[PDB]
DNA sequence: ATTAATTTCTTGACCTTCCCCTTGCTGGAAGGTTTATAATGGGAGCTGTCACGGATGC
């Protein structure tokens, strides 16, 4: 919870390259959201690397992921 | 009130597609998963809309 609650400013400032007017704002923040709770238990920080940066790949897939099945009301796939 | 040559009915005997399938790939479509430097308070009207009630605060 604080490691999520700690990176919303994460999801807020990678959401400005895909505001386009398919998907409202909040939508891509909680997809995001749910992107960035993926990351938490793949995030194995042994290695020695920043969240924000690992957590960058798996909010944009989230993202994408979001404007591939919504944002459209034929629904097209993500390939 | 009779039946013998035509004219229909019925029954095997044949004739097509529909669809699944034959080995061997070959390509296309739908769905889920990582990627590991650094990425941390975002964004957008539109008012030049005017005159009523219904609820809020002295």
């Known amino acids: 919870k604080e490691m999520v609650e ?3 400013r ?3 400032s990678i ?3 895909y505001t386009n007017r398919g998907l409202q704002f ?3 923040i ?3 959201n749910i992107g960035l709770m993926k990351a938490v238990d793949k995030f194995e920080y042994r290695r020695g690397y920043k969240f924000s940066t690992y957590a ?6 989230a ?8 944002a459209r009301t034929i629904r097209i796939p993500v390939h």
Do not use: F, M, P, Y
């Open 63 to 70: 993202i994408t992921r979001s404007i591939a099945d919504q």
């Open 15 to 17: 959401a400005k390259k």
């Open 30 to 32: 909680q997809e995001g």
């Open 6 to 8: 700690a990176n919303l």
């Open 56 to 61: 960058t790949w798996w909010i944009r897939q």
């Open 10 to 12: 994460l999801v807020i």
């Open 26 to 28: 909040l939508d891509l």
